Amino acid sequence: LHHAVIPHGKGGRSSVSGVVATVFGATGFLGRYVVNHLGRMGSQVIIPYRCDVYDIMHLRLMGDLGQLTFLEWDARDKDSIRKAVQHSNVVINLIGREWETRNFDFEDVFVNIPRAIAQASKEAGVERFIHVSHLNASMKSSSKSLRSKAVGEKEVRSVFPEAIIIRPSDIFGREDRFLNHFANYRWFLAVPLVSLGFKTVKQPVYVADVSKGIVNATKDPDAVGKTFAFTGPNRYLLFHLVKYIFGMTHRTFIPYPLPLFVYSWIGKLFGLSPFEPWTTKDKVERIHISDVMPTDLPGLEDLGVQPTPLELKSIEVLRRHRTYRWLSSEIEETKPAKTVNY
Amino acid sequence: TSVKPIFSRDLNEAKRRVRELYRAWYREVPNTVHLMQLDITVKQGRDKVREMFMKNAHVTDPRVVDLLVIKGKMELQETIKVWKQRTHVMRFFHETETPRPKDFLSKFYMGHDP
Amino acid sequence: LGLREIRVHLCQRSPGSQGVRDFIVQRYVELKKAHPNLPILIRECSEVQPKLWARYAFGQEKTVSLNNLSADEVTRAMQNVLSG
Amino acid sequence: FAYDGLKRQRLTEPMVRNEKGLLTYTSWEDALSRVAGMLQNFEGNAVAAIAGGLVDAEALVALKDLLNKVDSDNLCTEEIFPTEGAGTDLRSNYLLNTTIAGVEEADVVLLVGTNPRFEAPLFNARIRKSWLHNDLKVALIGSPVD
Amino acid sequence: TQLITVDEKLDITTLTGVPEEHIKTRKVRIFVPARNNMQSGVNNTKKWKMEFDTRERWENPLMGWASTADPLSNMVLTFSAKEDAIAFAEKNGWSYDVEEKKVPKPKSKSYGANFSWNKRTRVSTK
Amino acid sequence: ILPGAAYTEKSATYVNTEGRAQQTKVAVTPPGLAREDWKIIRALSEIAGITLPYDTLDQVRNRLEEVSPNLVRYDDIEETNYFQQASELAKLVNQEVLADPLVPPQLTIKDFYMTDSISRASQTMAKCVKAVTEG
Amino acid sequence: KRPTVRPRSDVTHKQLSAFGEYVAEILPKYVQQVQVSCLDELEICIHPDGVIPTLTFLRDHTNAQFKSLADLTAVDVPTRQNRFEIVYNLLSLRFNSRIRVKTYADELTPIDSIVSVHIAANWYEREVWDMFGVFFFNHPDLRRILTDYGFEGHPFRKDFPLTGYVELRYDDEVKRVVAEPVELAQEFRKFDLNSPWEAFPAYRQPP
Amino acid sequence: GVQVSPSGEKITHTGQVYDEKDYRRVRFVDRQKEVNENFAIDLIAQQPVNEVEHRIIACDGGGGALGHPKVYINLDKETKTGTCGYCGLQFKQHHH
Numbered sequence A: 001l002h003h004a005v006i007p008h009g010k011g012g013r014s015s016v017s018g019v020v021a022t023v024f025g026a027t028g029f030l031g032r033y034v035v036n037h038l039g040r041m042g043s044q045v046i047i048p049y050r051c052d053v054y055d056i057m058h059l060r061l062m063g064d065l066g067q068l069t070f071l072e073w074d075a076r077d078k079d080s081i082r083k084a085v086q087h088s089n090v091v092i093n094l095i096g097r098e099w100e101t102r103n104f105d106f107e108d109v110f111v112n113i114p115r116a117i118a119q120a121s122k123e124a125g126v127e128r129f130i131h132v133s134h135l136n137a138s139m140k141s142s143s144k145s146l147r148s149k150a151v152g153e154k155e156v157r158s159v160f161p162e163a164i165i166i167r168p169s170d171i172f173g174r175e176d177r178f179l180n181h182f183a184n185y186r187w188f189l190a191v192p193l194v195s196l197g198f199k200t201v202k203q204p205v206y207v208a209d210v211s212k213g214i215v216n217a218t219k220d221p222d223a224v225g226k227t228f229a230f231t232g233p234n235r236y237l238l239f240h241l242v243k244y245i246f247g248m249t250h251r252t253f254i255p256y257p258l259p260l261f262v263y264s265w266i267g268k269l270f271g272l273s274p275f276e277p278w279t280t281k282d283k284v285e286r287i288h289i290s291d292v293m294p295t296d297l298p299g300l301e302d303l304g305v306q307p308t309p310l311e312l313k314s315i316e317v318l319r320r321h322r323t324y325r326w327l328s329s330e331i332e333e334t335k336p337a338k339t340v341n342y
Numbered sequence B: 001t002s003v004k005p006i007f008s009r010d011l012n013e014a015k016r017r018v019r020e021l022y023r024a025w026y027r028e029v030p031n032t033v034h035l036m037q038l039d040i041t042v043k044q045g046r047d048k049v050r051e052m053f054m055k056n057a058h059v060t061d062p063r064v065v066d067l068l069v070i071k072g073k074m075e076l077q078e079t080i081k082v083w084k085q086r087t088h089v090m091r092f093f094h095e096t097e098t099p100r101p102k103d104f105l106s107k108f109y110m111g112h113d114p
Numbered sequence C: 001l002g003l004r005e006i007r008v009h010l011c012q013r014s015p016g017s018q019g020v021r022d023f024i025v026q027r028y029v030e031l032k033k034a035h036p037n038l039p040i041l042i043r044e045c046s047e048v049q050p051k052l053w054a055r056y057a058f059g060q061e062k063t064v065s066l067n068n069l070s071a072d073e074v075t076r077a078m079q080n081v082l083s084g
Numbered sequence D: 001f002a003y004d005g006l007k008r009q010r011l012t013e014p015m016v017r018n019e020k021g022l023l024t025y026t027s028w029e030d031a032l033s034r035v036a037g038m039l040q041n042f043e044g045n046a047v048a049a050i051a052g053g054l055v056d057a058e059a060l061v062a063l064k065d066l067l068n069k070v071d072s073d074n075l076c077t078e079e080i081f082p083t084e085g086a087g088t089d090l091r092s093n094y095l096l097n098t099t100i101a102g103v104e105e106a107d108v109v110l111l112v113g114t115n116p117r118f119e120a121p122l123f124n125a126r127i128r129k130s131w132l133h134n135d136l137k138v139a140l141i142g143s144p145v146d
Numbered sequence E: 001t002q003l004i005t006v007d008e009k010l011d012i013t014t015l016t017g018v019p020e021e022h023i024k025t026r027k028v029r030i031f032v033p034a035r036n037n038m039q040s041g042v043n044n045t046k047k048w049k050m051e052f053d054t055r056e057r058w059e060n061p062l063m064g065w066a067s068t069a070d071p072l073s074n075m076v077l078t079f080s081a082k083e084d085a086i087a088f089a090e091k092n093g094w095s096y097d098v099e100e101k102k103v104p105k106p107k108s109k110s111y112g113a114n115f116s117w118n119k120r121t122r123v124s125t126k
Numbered sequence F: 001i002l003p004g005a006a007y008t009e010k011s012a013t014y015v016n017t018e019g020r021a022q023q024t025k026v027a028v029t030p031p032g033l034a035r036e037d038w039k040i041i042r043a044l045s046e047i048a049g050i051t052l053p054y055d056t057l058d059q060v061r062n063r064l065e066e067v068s069p070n071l072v073r074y075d076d077i078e079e080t081n082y083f084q085q086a087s088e089l090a091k092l093v094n095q096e097v098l099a100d101p102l103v104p105p106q107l108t109i110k111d112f113y114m115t116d117s118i119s120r121a122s123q124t125m126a127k128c129v130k131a132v133t134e135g
Numbered sequence G: 001k002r003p004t005v006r007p008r009s010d011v012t013h014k015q016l017s018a019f020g021e022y023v024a025e026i027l028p029k030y031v032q033q034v035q036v037s038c039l040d041e042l043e044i045c046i047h048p049d050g051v052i053p054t055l056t057f058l059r060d061h062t063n064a065q066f067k068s069l070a071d072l073t074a075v076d077v078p079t080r081q082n083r084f085e086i087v088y089n090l091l092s093l094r095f096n097s098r099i100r101v102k103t104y105a106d107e108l109t110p111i112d113s114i115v116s117v118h119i120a121a122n123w124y125e126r127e128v129w130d131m132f133g134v135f136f137f138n139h140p141d142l143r144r145i146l147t148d149y150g151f152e153g154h155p156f157r158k159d160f161p162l163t164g165y166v167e168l169r170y171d172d173e174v175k176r177v178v179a180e181p182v183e184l185a186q187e188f189r190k191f192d193l194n195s196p197w198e199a200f201p202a203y204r205q206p207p
Numbered sequence H: 001g002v003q004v005s006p007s008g009e010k011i012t013h014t015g016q017v018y019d020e021k022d023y024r025r026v027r028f029v030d031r032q033k034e035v036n037e038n039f040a041i042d043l044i045a046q047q048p049v050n051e052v053e054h055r056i057i058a059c060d061g062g063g064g065a066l067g068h069p070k071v072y073i074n075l076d077k078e079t080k081t082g083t084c085g086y087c088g089l090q091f092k093q094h095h096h
C-alpha cells in the first residue's frame, strides 16, 4: 500500500479509509447512498457527473474536505473516463436507466459504457471493478433491459475478469421508482395488474443494504471475481405487496386484471413523454417478471449485511403519500404482507 | 460513611422512584411515536427505555440514583412536551454509528486502539 | 511430567518467606548440582507472598503457597514437584 | 540525536514472500495465517525465537508463553551470558548490585573488559564524579583507553 | 434531614456523560511535570498533573494537518497533592499509575574547593 | 515480516543493569500498520489454535508479576543477597581463560555512534562518524 | 502619584472590613473566612446551609439592602473534595456598594435555591445545573437552559473536553441530523505557556 | 526555478511534489497547482555582496521601522561572508 492509502483513524467522516473510488452514476437513487457510506468512513470519492452542478449539492456535504472530487465527463468521450480512473483503486459502475432516449439506447448504457469503463480501469491499474447488473438478468428475458444487462456483464467480465458483479432485485427507498410507483398508481383510481398480481414474485431489498454491500466488497478479499445476488429476506406476490403498499398509504385498493398486450401499449404511450416517463413498456415487462430464486448465489450476509425487511422501512417511504387523516397512523395498524416460498 | 441524602434515605425508596419513572416512560412512548411521526414501532421504544435504564443498573448510592431519576424526568419532560424533535429521540438508537466490535482481534486489525 | 522450569518467589526481609531463604542457602546448591540443566529461578521481591511456580510442558503452570513454613516443608514441596 | 532513525528505514506494513521469493506487501490476516499454519505443523525443539536488544518485557513474555504452549524452550537472546554455574537462576549474577549511586560510596573500582565510556557513559560519568570528589581510585584489566 | 450510611466507594461515571470507551479503556497518568533542562526554573515542578494516554494522530490528506478521534488528547488537570488526584481518578472511574515526586538531593558546594592544594577539585578554568 | 513498534511508540517495561524496572510511555503511534509486539503475538496465537489469556496490557503485566515480580516495581530496585551460593556453585567448572588480551568492541568514539538499528538508520550519527574519522 | 500604577484608597477597605465584621458577628452560624482584597471587594464565605438566611438578611436588613442579584456562578476546582465554588455577587443601590457571597458544593451535595429571595436566580441556577451538574432544591422548573435537548455532560467542568465527545452532521440515508463521535481534521494544539520562574513572591506557596 | 517532475507536477521551493502513484493528484485534475514562480533563494543569491570598511556592520534591512531588528555582523573571516539572519544580504570586509 502507498503511504497515503494506509487507513488511519476510527472510521469517521474525517478519517482515512484507504479507498479511492470513482463512482459512475452517483447522481442517482443508489449512487447517493453509496457515496454517503463511502464518505462516512473517510474515503476519497471521485464523482464524474454529466448533469448540472445544481444536482450534486446533496452530495457535496456527505464527505469531509477534499474527500469528494467532482468531474465533468461524457460517455462518448473516452478521455473523460481515463482522467477519472487515472488515480482510483476502485470503480463502481452504477450507470443505468429505465427508459431509452433520443440519444442513448439500453445497449449504450448497459453494454458499451460499462465496457469502456472497464477497459480504462484495467489499462489504468485499478484493482477492483464493481458492476451492478440485475438479478433477473438473462439473454432470454422478455424485457430488453435485462438482455442488455446480461450482455453488458458478459463484456465487462471479458474485459475485466476480476470484476465484482452485483445483481440486486427491485430496490425500494425514499427516492425509488418501485414503492413510489406502486403508490402513485392511485392517481388513476385503480391498480391494473397482470394475472391480478398472482403468478409474479418479488424479493425486494432496501437500498442501504445494497450500498453497504458495495462498500464492503470494496475491501473484501474473498469477493474478487465473484457474482452476488442482493435480495431481501422475504418473497411476496405482487398482489399482496401492492395491497400492503396501499395499506401503508391507507388509500383505496381496487385491483383488476389486465392482459399484458394492452398494458404494454399503455406503457409505450406513457413512454412517449420527452421528459422522465411515468412508466414504460420495459418497466412493465420488468414488473410481472417473477423473481429468480437465490439459486446458490452469494449475498448480503456473505458481504457482512443483515437485510432489512420491508415492514420496517416502508413507512418512511409511504408516509409522503398518505393524507392528513392517516399521516400519524403507526406501522402496526397495517396488516403485513403474506410471505411465500415458491 | 455519613453523608447528606438528596431524597432517598435508602436504595428502596430510590427504587420506588425509578419504578415510577419507568411507568411514565412506558406510558409515554406511544404518544411520542404518534406525535413525532417516528418510523419505529412501540416495542422498539420500550426496549430502548429498558436498555437505557439497565445502562445504570449497577449503581448502589441512592444519591446517584436520585440524580439519574432527576435527569430522566427532565428528559421525559422534554419529550412529553415536544421541545425535542425526532432527531434527538432517534439519537438514542445510533442508526449510523458503525458498531465497534468487542473482538480483540478486529480491534487489532483496525487501528491501535485497545 | 514434562517439567521445564521451577521459579521461586519470596521476600528478602519478611517472616513468612523465612523458610525459603534458609532452604535456599542450605540446599539450592546441592539441588542445582543434582539437576544441572534445569532452571531453578529465584526472583525475590518486596512485600510479596512467597510461591513456587512449576510450569510443565505445553505451558501449564502450577502454584503452591509457601507462606509461614520451615525449610523442610519447602524441601518436601519442591521434591514433590520434581517427582510429580 | 539518534531519534532521526525512527524516521527512516522503517517497517510500516506486513510483508511476505511471493512465488518468486521476493518480499511483497500484504495484510495482517494473510501473514498471521501463514505463520499460524507453520506454527501448527511444528512442535518443540524445531521452533525457536531470538531477541535483539530493543525488545520489551511484554513481547518477551508473550513469545515465551506462545513457544511454551507449542512446547519449545529454545528462547534465546543475541547477547552471550554464561549459564555455566548459577546462570540466570540468581539475579546477583547478572545485575549491577552496587547500584549506580553506589559508586559514590565506593573507594576502589576495578574495570574488567569494559570501555564504560562508549558502553555506558553515565556510569563512566559517575565514576569520574567520584574520582573528582571522593578521591576514588580506579583500576582496569583491559585494553588501554582514555 | 439527618445523615445516611452509604458505606461504599464513590462512583460518578453515570453523571458525567462519559462513554464506556473513555472510562474503561483509559489509563490516566498522575505525576509532577519534570523540569525542562533548557531552563533552570523550578516553578512548574510544584503542582501535580493528570494526563491521559496518547492515541493516534494521522495526517489529513487535504492539507497535512494532525487529526484525532481522541477528545481527551489535550486534557490536563492540576492538583495540589497526590491523594487529590487519586481521588478524582477513582471517582470518575479511571485507571491510574502514579509516579512519585523527584526532588533534587541537597548538595555540598564550596567555592574554595576550586582552589585546593592536594585534591582534584582544583580547576584550571577561572 | 510483522512490523512492530519503537520505544517512542509503545508502553513497555525495560530493566537496566541494576534491576530497576522503568516504563516507557506513548508519545506517538506506530507508523502505517505497525503495531505493539505483544499485540501482534496475541493475535497470532488467537489465529492459531492457541490463545493467550491476556487481551490487554494490565493482564500482560499481571503475567509479568507472575513470572518475575521485579518487572512491575517501577523505579524501584530489589536487594539480592545470594552471591555466596552462586560462588560455591561456580567454583566447580573446569574451564580456564585463554590468555588472549580481552579488548572491548568500542575502542574509540567512531565505534560508538552506530551500534543498533535506530543508530545505523540515523543520518546524524553518520555525520558524526564522518566528522570523527576525517578529523 | 505614579502614573502607571492604580490609585489605592483605604477608606473603602475599612468600610467593607467593618461591614464584614458586622455580618460575621450577626451570622456566626454560617459565616466562614470573611476577607477583603487589595482591590476593594468584600467576600463572605459560608456554609451552604446558610444560603437562604444570609441572602435574605442581606436583601431585607436595613444596613444591608443588597436586593439586586447581579450574577450567580460556579467555579470548578477539582483539587478540593468539594469542587464547585458557588458565588453570589450582589449590589446595594442605597449604599452604592457590592458584595460577594460564596459557598461550596459537590457532584452529590446539592444546595437550596434562592428564587424565594431573588427571582433573578431561576435561570442562573438552571445554568449552573446545565454547566456543572449542581442540583438545587425547591426550584420551580429546573431543566437545561443552554445545552442541546439531549446533551450528556456538564461542559464547564474542568474534566470535560473543550471539544466534547460527539459531533453533528446530516445523513441522507436517514434524512436527519445525527450525532457521531468527535473526529477533527486539525486537533486543538495545547501550548505550555507557564514560565518556570516565580512571578509574584507575595503568593508563594510554602512547602 | 520551477522544475517539473516525471508526472508534470511542478516542484515547489519546498521540494514538494506528489509521486506518480499518489492518488492525491486528483485535486489537480481539470484544475491547476498553485506555485510561486519567484523562488526567494535564487533571488537573494542574485544580489551582490555589499563591501564595507568596518569590521562590524549592522543590518536593519531597509526603511528602518519597515525592515527587521537591527543585528550586528562580524566580518573577520576574510574567506567567508557575513549573512544577516533575517534577510540574506551578504557583507565583506573591503580592506580584509
Ligand SMILES: NC(=O)C1=CN([C@@H]2O[C@H](COP(=O)(O)OP(=O)(O)OC[C@H]3O[C@@H](n4cnc5c(N)ncnc54)[C@H](OP(=O)(O)O)[C@@H]3O)[C@@H](O)[C@H]2O)C=CC1
Residues within 6 Å of the ligand: A025, A026, A027, A028, A029, A030, A031, A049, A050, A051, A075, A093, A094, A095, A096, A097, A098, A104, A109, A132, A133, A134, A135, A168, A169, A170, A171, A172, A177, A178
Ligand atoms: N430499482 C432500482 O433502482 C434498481 C437499480 N439497479 C441498478 O442500479 C443502477 C442505478 O439504479 P438508479 O440509481 O436507480 O438509476 P438512476 O436512474 O437513479 O441514476 C442512474 C445514473 O445513471 C446515470 N446515467 C444514465 N445514463 C447516462 C448517460 N447516458 N450518461 C451519463 N450518465 C448516465 C445518471 O446520471 P444523470 O442522472 O446525471 O444523467 C444517474 O446518476 C442501475 O444501473 C440499475 O440497473 C438494479 C436493480 C433495480
Ligand SMILES: [Zn+2]
Residues within 6 Å of the ligand: H059, H060, H061, H068, H084, H085, H086, H087, H088, H089
Ligand atoms: Zn538584514
